[PDB]
Design an enzyme around this catalytic site. Sequence first.
Site, PDB file in Angstrom:
ATOM      1  N   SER A 175       0.835  -1.191   0.000  1.00  0.00           N
ATOM      2  CA  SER A 175       0.000   0.000   0.000  1.00  0.00           C
ATOM      3  C   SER A 175       0.874   1.246   0.000  1.00  0.00           C
ATOM      4  CB  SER A 175      -0.926   0.011   1.213  1.00  0.00           C
ATOM      5  OG  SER A 175      -0.177   0.183   2.398  1.00  0.00           O
ATOM      6  N   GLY A 176       0.327   2.332  -0.540  1.00  0.00           N
ATOM      7  CA  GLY A 176       1.097   3.521  -0.802  1.00  0.00           C
ATOM      8  C   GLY A 176       1.827   3.510  -2.128  1.00  0.00           C
ATOM      9  N   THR A 180      -4.273   0.495  -4.335  1.00  0.00           N
ATOM     10  CA  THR A 180      -5.704   0.690  -4.558  1.00  0.00           C
ATOM     11  C   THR A 180      -5.969   1.134  -5.993  1.00  0.00           C
ATOM     12  OG1 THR A 180      -5.953   1.273  -2.222  1.00  0.00           O
ATOM     13  CG2 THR A 180      -7.755   1.874  -3.691  1.00  0.00           C
ATOM     14  N   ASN A 218       6.078   0.942   5.521  1.00  0.00           N
ATOM     15  CA  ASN A 218       4.782   1.409   5.046  1.00  0.00           C
ATOM     16  C   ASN A 218       3.949   1.839   6.242  1.00  0.00           C
ATOM     17  OD1 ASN A 218       2.471   1.973   3.584  1.00  0.00           O
ATOM     18  ND2 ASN A 218       2.199  -0.103   2.787  1.00  0.00           N
ATOM     19  N   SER A 221       0.797  -0.425   6.141  1.00  0.00           N
ATOM     20  CA  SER A 221       1.288  -1.713   5.658  1.00  0.00           C
ATOM     21  C   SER A 221       0.219  -2.791   5.706  1.00  0.00           C
ATOM     22  CB  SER A 221       2.484  -2.151   6.495  1.00  0.00           C
ATOM     23  OG  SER A 221       2.092  -2.401   7.833  1.00  0.00           O
ATOM     24  N   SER A 222       0.106  -3.540   4.614  1.00  0.00           N
ATOM     25  CA  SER A 222      -0.831  -4.650   4.563  1.00  0.00           C
ATOM     26  C   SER A 222      -0.354  -5.787   5.449  1.00  0.00           C
ATOM     27  CB  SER A 222      -1.009  -5.132   3.127  1.00  0.00           C
ATOM     28  OG  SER A 222      -1.922  -6.211   3.067  1.00  0.00           O
ATOM     29  N   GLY A 444       4.085  -7.851   1.059  1.00  0.00           N
ATOM     30  CA  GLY A 444       5.358  -8.154   0.440  1.00  0.00           C
ATOM     31  C   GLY A 444       6.337  -8.836   1.380  1.00  0.00           C
ATOM     32  N   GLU A 446       9.073  -9.037   3.287  1.00  0.00           N
ATOM     33  CA  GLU A 446       9.709  -7.842   3.817  1.00  0.00           C
ATOM     34  C   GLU A 446      10.819  -8.199   4.796  1.00  0.00           C
ATOM     35  OE1 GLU A 446       6.559  -5.582   5.491  1.00  0.00           O
ATOM     36  OE2 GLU A 446       5.775  -7.228   6.715  1.00  0.00           O
TER      37      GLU A 446
END
Length: 742
Positions: A175-176, A180, A218, A221-222, A444, A446
């Site tokens: 995200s970011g 989306t 993030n 962050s997801s 991701g 990470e």
Amino acid sequence: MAAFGEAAPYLRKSEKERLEAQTRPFDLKKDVYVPDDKEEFVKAKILSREGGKVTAETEHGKTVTVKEDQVLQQNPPKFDKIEDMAMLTFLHEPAVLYNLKERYASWMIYTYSGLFCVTINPYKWLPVYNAEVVAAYRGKKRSEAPPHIFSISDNAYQYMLTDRENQSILITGESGAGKTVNTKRVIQYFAVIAALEDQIIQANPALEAFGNAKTVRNDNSSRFGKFIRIHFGATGKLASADIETYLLEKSRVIFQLKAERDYHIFYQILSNKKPELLDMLLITNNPYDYAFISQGETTVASIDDAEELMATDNAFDVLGFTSEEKNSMYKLTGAIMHFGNMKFKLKQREEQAEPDGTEEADKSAYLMGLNSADLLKGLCHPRVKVGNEYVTKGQNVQQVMYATGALAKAVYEKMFNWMVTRINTTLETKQPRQYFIGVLDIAGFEIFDFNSFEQLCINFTNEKLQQFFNHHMFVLEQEEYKKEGIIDFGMDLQACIDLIEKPMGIMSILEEECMFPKATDMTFKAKLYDNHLGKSNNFQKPRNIKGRPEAHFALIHYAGTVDYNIIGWLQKNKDPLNETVVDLYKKSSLKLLSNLFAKKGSSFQTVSALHRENLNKLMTNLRSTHPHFVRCIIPNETKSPGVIDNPLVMHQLRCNGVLEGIRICRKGFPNRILYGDFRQRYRILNPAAIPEGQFIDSRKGAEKLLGSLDIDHNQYKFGHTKVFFKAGLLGLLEEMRDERLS
């Protein structure tokens, strides 16, 4: 070539820049890629050779000499700004970095990377991604068309029509990074080739608030995974859509790192945006006050809690549900909040932990709807069923703290999965749903300075996804190589999964380490060093560079040597589901009555175990489909023009698994050249006394070529429709051609 259909001139990349880029002077015998310390990879000319130490001079200026093992070979200018990065013959890791940033200089957003569709994120208006170029990719395949996810979405729609198989699209991105915008871009195309967009865009902000926490990189962050099935009809007509989210992180709810945050909903109620919830839920207006919300970070920059509640009350005011459940979800979150503050003091000369400080769990029992005394007795004395007759066990203070965390993480994940079904009731329409082309999103792979079990819950998930990629590449590459007549690559990843998934593996050793009476985290590291130090090739001792705080074991994943921190894994691994409190959850008059309605692990089921089962269920959901990968990366910290910082793109090169699929195709033959294509361009290398003419058949017209190139048989492999070459030959097809063009 993106003419004929009113598309942007950079996406053409022909007759203006490519035909003059195939002749620019870059002498590869004096030009290399030099490793920088800040950019880490940058083009350099070399004045003269000396052997092991070459006197390098880069485009930014340094005259120092660099080791030959440090510098790497440089791609030709005819394959500079390469379209498909599987067609390139010198496929280093700066061969994706430098080509990505110079295709970003022309702002080439999408790029074929073999099976990957690599997507940099510049910010502008895009004329290409709308209707008239949907007309320029409808029916258009991978090879002839320029890169586009409407092209691979029409390939998924193509094998959806023709192969009669569930096609799938696995977007990997954070995200970011316009994620989306990426998912909106994916689901925009299916309604156009049909002949519920506003419910996806409306459904997303509350989802972002319930499930997208903060990691260090993030700020939104997801944590969990999305899986949006756009269901079709019989002959390709858009029927419906459903979501079924995977791997909502339980430990994220309970255990928060100081450089991390929880899910946003608790912070929203801690915000003063809506005072009726603060009077309603008996909350003291303070994130620092509560034990769940003080182990981590209260708040960071670039995020506002009242904006988060502004997202949730917009999604909660209008959706398919009624108005009472808007109260009920907040009742459950503020019902989670009052659990952990309870003391559970030990009795004197006993072990059973009695709550004597019963003010805060009384406020909980008012918030849920449970009884005040029954909750305390149920947490203190869990009653179990033996044979026919019930017996109670005691507890100590530790097991009741793991119970009062475990019930909270369980009711939060079951509430969130429930909410996914409640949004699914809105998103489903009564058209006949058949043969989805569903699109998954995930966090991701990470790699931080504090890789913990939370980070292991991300890392092994994306590890298994990459395992599906390696087999899925191998079946396709096997299909072309069996068409042409020319160890599995998944084994290259399998050992790491062998270290993690199999019994007597790190997740299994972490699970059984809890079962011992007095096993602390130091005992757990001692056991991992007992079982795997030297026994397995992946497992290795952690080097600590640059002042990491502490590193306890290192696993060389596909991203490389990745350390980990043991300390606190045994506290966050546990999920003892207290059964009689689940009975009292059933008895309470609230949503929870509908929510919480050979055996295995009644008292010992762990976050690693449900991660293992949910990941296996995502796998068997995914092995029944056919993937079409999309990658998506952020340029840098600022939503900015061309100031892309190469550490980030080099790090997300390996974290997205892009460099893996880059290097897996290199072990075979990636140089896929047609015979007449080898004669229209590379007969110039060593022709006969007569020019091309098209008077010899192109298989024999290339056999005439390779019979005089002074190249041995082990370097190439001859086929039927094309001829293939090892990575490192189509720059050898020009080093003597520049001797011909001298």
